Structure formats: C-alpha cells, structure tokens
Design a protein around this ligand. Structure first.
Ligand SMILES: *[C@@H]1O[C@H](CO)[C@@H](O[C@@H]2O[C@H](CO)[C@@H](O[C@@H]3O[C@H](CO)[C@@H](O)[C@H](O)[C@@H]3O)[C@H](O)[C@H]2NC(C)=O)[C@H](O)[C@H]1NC(C)=O
Ligand SMILES: *[C@@H]1O[C@H](CO)[C@@H](O[C@@H]2O[C@H](CO)[C@@H](O[C@@H]3O[C@H](CO)[C@@H](O)[C@H](O)[C@@H]3O)[C@H](O)[C@H]2NC(C)=O)[C@H](O)[C@H]1NC(C)=O
Lengths: 104, 156, 201, 80, 104, 80, 156, 201
C-alpha cells in the first residue's frame, strides 16, 4: 500500500568506501525506486506488456508474484579520480541517477 | 379454414396464402393457408407467425413461428420468454406433451395458443377488448376484427 | 464413489456461428494441470427447431470451440467428465447466444390481392424469412408493371419490421403488377423474394 | 484516432489519489473503458483493465409493473 | 538464496479470462524473473551502474533494499482476434516473452 | 586493452556454482581483480567488486628469525 | 674531528666535506665535517647519514640523517622502525630527552648513536666483527676500518 | 558529561602531497546525518624534521582533505569534536604515508679527493639530496675536463642507491676534472649537483 514511486537516496562515498578513489564529488543523489505494482498502476506505464500479463496472473494465482518497482529511466553524472600519474580524470558514468520508476 | 372473429361470429374462408388475423400496435398474427385437397376451395393452416411487438421496459420484440410438424416451445431466437429475468411479462409453454403450445403475454393480457392437428395448425387468441381495437386505420385488414373479405368466403 | 461434475461453465460468444465453452474441474490440482487419461464430453443444443437432439464433442482440454451454430440463436451447454470407467453427470448448464447475421433467405409466402371496395388499392401479405438470422428491422417492397425492368427502376416501398401486410394505393386497373419483397436486419439486407404476378380488376 | 484507455486510467488514478470511496471512481473508470470499447479491440492494456476493474468491483462490493390493468375478446382459426 | 534467474510461466488464457477475445493461441509461455541480487551478481550484468551502487548501499545500510530481479530482455509474439466484422486480425505484441533476467 | 574485471566475476561465479568452500574462490577472485587493478582505475564495477569481495571475506572469515647469531668492534667520531 | 677506529686507535683528522666512516654490504655511514673556526684544520661534524641496507625478509632499506639542530627520532621517511610489525629488527629511539638518539639493528647486531653537542654531532657505532669486515675490496675507503688517509691527518 | 571522541579514523592516500581523512561519530544518528552546530577539529604531523608541531583544521563534515604534505613521508592523524562548550579528547590516531615523488634537490656535499697511494684514481663522496622524495635507487656521476662541454658529452657513471662514496680509476695526472652528481628514485631522476672542480696531482 505504498505504490511504485521514486524515493531519495544520497550516497555518501565516505559512508560507502569510495572516498579513497573519488576525488569529487563527496557523494551523489542516486535515488531509488520502491513500492507495490497493483491493478491500475502496472497498467499505467511505463510498463511492459509482460508486466501487465504478470500482474494479471498474480491476480488469479498469487503464487506468481506481482511486477517489480524499478528504475525505468536513468541519467549520467560526471565524477573525478586520479590516473597513474596523480593527474585528474573526469569521467561520465551512465545510469547513475534515477529519473523515473516503473513496473517490470 | 374456419374463422371465429372477435365479434363472435363464424366464417369459413379460403384465404389461401398469407393472411393477417391481427396487425395492431401490440401484436401481429399471420397465417399461411393452403387447400386441404388440390383444386379445392376449403383450406387449412400450415404456418402461424406471431410478433409480440416491443413494449418499452417490459419485453423487447419476440417472434413465434410454427409450421406443420415443427411446433417449438420457443421463439425463433431460441428463447422462451421476453425481457426481464424476474418478470415473466411474456413467456411460452409447451402443453399436452408438446401437441400444443401457449403464450402468456401478461403485459397485454393476451393469451395465444398454437396446436398441431394432423398435418396443419389451429390457432386461438384471447385478448383485451381495447388493446384488440388499438389498430390504426387503413391497417383495417385483420381477419379477427373484420372477418374475411366477402370474395374470400365459401358460403354465398 | 461417483465423480464430481465439472463446474463454472461459461460461454463466450465469438461470432454468429461460434461460441467457446470453458469449465473447471475441482477434481484437478488448482491453477492448473491435466495429468491423466481422463476426458471431457461437451454437449449443446437449442430449442429451434422443435425437438433438436444434442450435439457432442470429446475434449482433453478445459475449453471447447463450438462451431456451425445458427445465428441469433440461444444455445445451452453442459459438460461431463469421464476417467476410464467412472463418468460424472452433467454440469450446471450455461447458456450463450450467437450474434446476428444479415438475412440469407427471402421473405416467404408472398400473397397479393386487391382490397375489398377499393380496386385501385392492392394488399401485400407475406411471411418472414426462414433464415432471418436476426431481429427483422424492416422490409422493402418492389413493384413494376414490366417484370423485366432493371431492379433499381422498380418502385421501392420501405416498410417496418413488425408488419406482415401492407397497402399500396393509387394503381391502374386491368393491369398486371409484379412484386418482390426483401428483409433487413441490424446487419443488412437479405435476398429478394421471387416476383409474384398480380392483375388488378 | 484509436484506443483511449490511457486516459481512463490516468483519470481514475488522479481521482483515487484525491465506504463507496473507490466505488464512485471504479464505476466511472468502468464506464470510460466501455466507451473506448470498440477502438480497443486488440488492445492488451484494455483487456487487462477490464478484468482489473471488475477485480476491484468485488472488493469492496460495488455496483403490477407490466401486468395489464375489464373484459376480453376471442379470435380463432380452426381446422375441423 | 535462489539468485536472479528466469522461471517458466505458461499463461492459459482460459485461466486468465482472455479466451473470450483471443482466438489463438490458447495461451503462451511468458516466463518470469525471480531471485535475489547479491554482491557478485548485481555486478555480473546485465545491470545498471545504479543497481551496483544500490546493492553496495544495501551492503552498508540494509534499510535501503537490494536491486530487483526483472526482465531485461523480452520478445514479441503474434496473437489472433476478431474485428468488428468477425474477421481475423493477426497482431504482434511486443515485450510478451522473457528472454533474459537481470538486476535493476 | 582495458579493465578485465568482467572475467574475474564470471570465473568466480562458475566456481561457486560448481567450510573454506567460498574462501578458495574468494581469494582467487580477489587476486584476479588486483591483477587487472591498474586498468580498472576509474571503473565502477571494479571498485564495487573490491569491496564486494572483502564483504564476503568477513563471512566466513577467510585469509631468532632476524636477531644476529661472538665479539664486537667499535668506531666513533667525536667533537671534544 | 677525533676518530676512533674499529682497531682501537685514535686519530685526529681534517676530513673536511663528505666522508665515509662505513661503506659495506650491510651499512653505510657518511659524515660531512667542517672547520671548527674558519681557516682552521681542526674540524667537527654537522651531518650524519646512515643507510641500513635492505636485508631480505627483515627490513627494507631505511635512512637516518641528522644535522646541526635537527636531530630527529625517525628515519627520513618519517618511520621509527624497519619492516615487520611484530619484529623490531630495526628501530630508533630518542634518549636523554632528545639530546641523542640510538638505533638498534638487531638483525646485524649493530647499535648506532647520534648526539648533538653544541653546534655539531658526535657518532658512535658498535658492530659485530665479521659483519664490519664484510665490505668488498676497492670499497676500501672506510674511516672506521682503515683510518684517515695520512694526508688528512693533523699529527705529522 | 564528557563527550565521546570520534572513532574509525582512516587515511586514504591520494597523492604524494595529499591524504583524505575520514572518521565516525557514534554520537550521531547512524547511516547518517549531521544536524547541529558542532564541529570537528583535525590535526596532523610527522616526525621529520625534529620537533614539528601539529597542523589544524576545523570541519563540519566527517571527512577532511589534508594537502601540502612532504612526499614519501609517514603522517599521523587524529580528530576531536566540539559542540558549543563541550569538546572531546582526540581520537585513536591513525597513520598514512604519502606516495613518492621524483627527487627535487641535487645531492649535497659533493667532496672530491685523490686516493692514497694511487693518484690516477680519485674518490667522490657526497650526501643524499635533502629533497630525495622517495627511496633513492641510484645516483649518476658526471665528469669532464672541459667544464663547459654539453652535459650529454660528459662521462656518465651509474652508481647504486646505497653508497655515498665511489671510485673512478685511470685518469690523467696534473689535470683539472669537474664533477656533477644526480639522484634517482622509483619516479625518476632529480636535478644535477653543482659542478665541483678537482685537480689531479
Ligand atoms: C466420445 O467418447 C466416448 C467415451 O470414450 C466414446 O464412446 C465409445 O465409442 C465407441 C464407438 O461408438 C464404442 O465402441 C463400442 O464398440 C463395440 C464393438 O467393439 C460395440 O458393441 C458398441 O456398442 C460400441 O460401439 C465404445 O464402447 C464407447 N465407449 C464408451 C465409454 O462410451 C464416443 O464414441 C466418443 N464419441 C464422440 C462422438 O465424441
Ligand atoms: C578552530 O575552531 C576553534 C573552535 O571554534 C577556534 O577557536 C576560537 O578561535 C578564536 C580566534 O583565536 C578565539 O578568539 C578569542 O578571542 C578573544 C578576544 O575576543 C581572545 O582573548 C582570545 O584569546 C581568543 O583569541 C576563540 O575564543 C576560540 N574559541 C575556542 C573555543 O577555542 C579556532 O580559532 C579555529 N582555528 C583553526 C586554525 O582552525
């Protein structure tokens, strides 16, 4: 009884043990998806036909589980680290931040 | 065949082919008759059709038809009753283990019987006075109301 | 001792000639499986015409496709199971009724006469088509003095669906007229009846 | 130009976000779908939605008169 | 302790109530994904950087949940139904069958 | 030509699929990663893997000699 | 400055600039000396460097260096000991609250002292006989072994 | 009554001049938050040279970047918290040691003399560079009779890292020679020393 949404999540690289390699940033806002995928929502989209068929199957036979709340759209962010020579590298990491959730 | 009109008088008519006994705002009854022996003037009825016309909210249209040797206890569409589940405003029943059937149109206080006698059909109708007379004019040709046209009568 | 009958029997109408039947067997492990050499027997009939006898089908699936049905007709359906020697009685019977089809026979028994007292008026009586295939929403009367005139050059007279007699006024005396009628329903117009010849007095 | 089930769903969702609380909106959604009915003939989202609504229709459970009114006449046609 | 895999799932359209509209087939093999997404697997791919960052966060703070086992690759199948006129329509439905699972 | 962490992971996975059961293969995986070490300098999968292995390294827990051997001399450099 | 050799004899030498006291397979000791008053022959030591050469498995290389007024109790790299955590095979300690430091190289039974006296440094070494003599030849110039070259000596 | 000190103090070396310190405060709600006007004070020092005093930094984050450190040098690190009036004592001290850098000063105290008994042989003594910046893996001795000769035309003599004296044999008598030395470590070659002039007998 939450329903599939995006929730915030700031990853502190000290807290996670990446601060030995990432010069910057100190951490980033990754977010995460969480919540249930019921009879209208998994319909609602973004959802795959499969997700629809699955949630419908769940509705008949609850041994088969409902679809899952996951990131359906993500963005990239840039980060900094050092090369062999202690010189900076700026590198763009795909699929880091959740821009949208959905059922799959 | 032998006709008994609403007005309580008998007539024997040829009326070979298709003929309306009734044709009013509530009901149509149509018969096909045919000579009892070839080249004869005396006839009998081999097809009987009834149309229970739609009465808003009571029954949709239903149609009984029977012919020599096919006397069903249902309407053409396979059903045995009209409209509402709880209301039997119109229903049809088999009687005399199949040898005749009767239709109760409660909505128009009308009862209709159709029977097979040997190779032909008899018909009987009991109907409220006013509703019988409901027919619009120039819709005048109904045998039950006016009888046969004189030309179609065996007894000169 | 006696095998349960199948339950939850449903018809899903698919076309004017075709309905799918499905049913459940509480005998079997749920949601779902078939594992042994049992079979289902499906039967179906209507009331028209008088005294139809049932039709049968054997099936190893919990669904059967009933084809070749009359249009606009209500059918009833039931199922029994058999497993080797043991059979069940029949299920709860479930009903389903086929969709309409355009009519496919002409109107029958077209009968024509002159009106008593008024000879310039004639009366057409007829009977509905035996293959009406649906609720008749009207008829169309065609007439001509030239029986061979192209059909679109005949006089066309529309008519309501619930009347089997109709009056046409204002004709010529001592004249052969010819008549055809046709039926219509929610799905279209059926075939034309044979021309019937009648001569005014 | 085609199946507008997407609209029925969104509208339903908004109303639900805000006893027979759901049931007002369920019956509305159900009407909506039936109205885009024939456009959605082969549409997977529609056919699931249909069963989806009626699933929720179960939880909570939502969603003299003809006899003639004094004498009679009789007509008949007989064989002998 | 299962780990994210594909499991079979045959959807019987009678069992689901689509047999009133789908002429054929009687049902289809949809499959579904299920299973956990631990320290090597969510690494293993197909997985999004985000999934990796999330499972790593889970490993520090189990209040944030692990990534989710979902279909990452799907196929289409054709199905049959009838038009207004009781004539057949063959229609190809995308994303019906699970061809692969992963963590997201 | 670049970070081969993908191979370390797959190899590890196969071995695990098949007490210090894991720990044989964990220590192997850990060696593997250190060997692709400098190629994976900015690699997200590598840096997670590294912590990932050492996470599992905790559960189950895995993974006279110099003194001179008899007389001495002395040297010094003094200020006064 | 005043030199006491391994062989137990004294010498007073100029040896201005950089000079090796020891230079063998285990240890190097290097001093920079300078005239005690300008234009004088008499000298004192203002820099002392020691290199504890790497002994496989016991300590990696470490280096002590001290100069007038900078007498640390650590090696150049900031550490206070060599190699193993459990083994103090090489360690360095402050003494006389900082006024001298001493290095214990257990691995080579060698003890070295460095002290600040006013503006200069004294040095003392105690070393096993054999290891002292381990130096390869033409590596002959070690003051602790051979003494000063005659030319570098104040007492003719 | 007395505030706990921060714990779990770690250094992560990032470069020859730079280490990041991180620490934990059990005082705060876990995984994680900072919510009040408290602050951390970070201190750091080495042992070289003799009697360095500590360096300080105030920080409102649980991480601090320590810059401008000497290469190849071990540093120690500790943290205390303060909240208004209350402060804590210092944390468990944690150590971390900067990476190497190529040397940046020349060798010092280059001293040249002729060998006793053999005048065609000379002896070079020197002292390591004060900015060695890493374990010295060798030196290189340059010499020429022409002090102005281009550096690549001088005689080049490689030498091991752990010897501060070296012999060069087979020279000409009554001849001015000039000498430069340079240091090398794991990261490369440092600058050349000033030329020192010496004349054989
Ligand atoms: C549907 O399935 C039933 C049940 O399996 C079928 O019934 C079986 O039909 C055959 C053929 O009529 C029967 O054969 C018998 O053969 C002997 C001679 O060998 C003869 O004396 C019989 O009177 C009978 O014809 C068989 O016994 C019968 N078995 C059962 C249990 O009824 C049925 O044929 C299937 N039919 C349809 C139309 O789906
Ligand atoms: C790091 O943070 C501490 C704690 O906040 C700072 O200590 C504060 O520093 C200022 C400036 O030294 C002190 O000011 C005082 O001013 C009066 C005159 O108004 C004078 O009599 C003093 O002796 C003192 O200078 C302030 O009292 C002091 N507070 C505390 C609690 O120590 C410190 O300055 C910061 N420094 C660095 C280098 O990070």
């Amino acid at each position: 009884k939450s329903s599939c949404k995006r929730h915030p999540l700031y990853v502190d690289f000290s807290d996670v043990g990446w601060n030995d390699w990432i010069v910057a940033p100190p951490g980033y806002h990754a977010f995460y998806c969480h919540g249930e995928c019921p009879f209208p929502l998994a319909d609602h989209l973004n959802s795959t036909n499969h997700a629809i068929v699955q949630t419908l199957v769940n509705s008949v036979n609850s041994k088969i589980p409902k679809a899952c709340c996951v990131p359906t759209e993500l963005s990239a962010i840039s980060m900094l680290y050092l090369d062999e020579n202690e010189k900076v590298v700026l590198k763009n990491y795909q699929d880091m931040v959740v821009e949208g959730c959905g059922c799959r | 065949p032998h006709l008994r009109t609403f007005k309580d008088n008998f007539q024997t008519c040829k009326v070979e082919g298709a003929w309306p006994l009734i044709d009013n705002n509530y009901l149509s009854v149509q018969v096909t008759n045919v000579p009892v022996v070839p080249g004869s003037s005396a006839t009998a009825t081999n097809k009987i059709t009834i149309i229970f016309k739609a009465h808003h909210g009571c029954t949709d249209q239903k149609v009984y038809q029977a012919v020599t040797d096919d006397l069903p206890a249902a309407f053409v569409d396979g059903t045995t009753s009209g409209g509402d589940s709880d209301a039997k405003s119109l229903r049809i029943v088999e009687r005399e283990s199949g040898h005749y059937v009767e239709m109760h149109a409660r909505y128009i206080g009308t009862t209709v019987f159709v029977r097979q006698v040997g190779r032909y059909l008899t018909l009987a109708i009991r109907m409220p006075e006013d509703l019988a007379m409901s027919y619009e004019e120039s819709q005048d040709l109904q045998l039950c109301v006016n009888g046969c046209p004189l030309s179609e009568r065996i007894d000169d | 001792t006696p095998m349960m009958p199948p339950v939850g029997v449903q018809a899903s109408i698919l076309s004017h000639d075709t309905i799918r039947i499905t049913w459940a067997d509480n005998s079997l492990p749920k949601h779902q499986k078939i594992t042994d050499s049992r079979y289902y027997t499906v039967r179906w009939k209507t009331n028209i015409p008088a005294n139809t006898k049932y039709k049968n089908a054997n099936a190893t699936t919990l669904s059967y496709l009933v084809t070749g049905l009359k249009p606009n007709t209500l059918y009833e359906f039931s199922v029994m199971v058999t497993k080797g020697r043991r059979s069940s009685t029949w299920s709860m019977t479930a009903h389903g009724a086929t969709f309409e089809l355009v009519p496919t026979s002409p109107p029958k028994d077209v009968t024509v006469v002159s009106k008593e007292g008024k000879p310039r008026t004639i009366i057409v009586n007829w009977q509905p088509p035996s293959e009406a295939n649906g609720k008749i929403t009207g008829y169309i009367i065609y007439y001509s003095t030239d029986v061979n005139a192209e059909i679109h050059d005949w006089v066309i007279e529309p008519v309501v669906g619930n009347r089997l007699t109709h009056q046409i006024q204002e004709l010529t005396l001592d004249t052969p007229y010819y008549f055809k009628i046709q039926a219509r329903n929610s799905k279209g117009m059926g075939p034309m009846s044979e021309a019937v010849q009648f001569r005014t007095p | 130009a085609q199946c507008r089930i997407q609209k029925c769903t969104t509208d339903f969702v908004s109303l639900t976000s805000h006893d027979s609380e759901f049931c007002k909106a369920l019956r509305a959604y159900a009407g909506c779908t039936q109205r885009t009915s024939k456009a959605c003939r082969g549409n997977l989202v529609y056919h699931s939605a249909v069963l989806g609504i009626s699933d929720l229709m179960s939880q909570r459970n939502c969603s003299d008169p003809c006899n003639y009114h004094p004498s009679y006449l009789f007509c008949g046609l007989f064989g002998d």
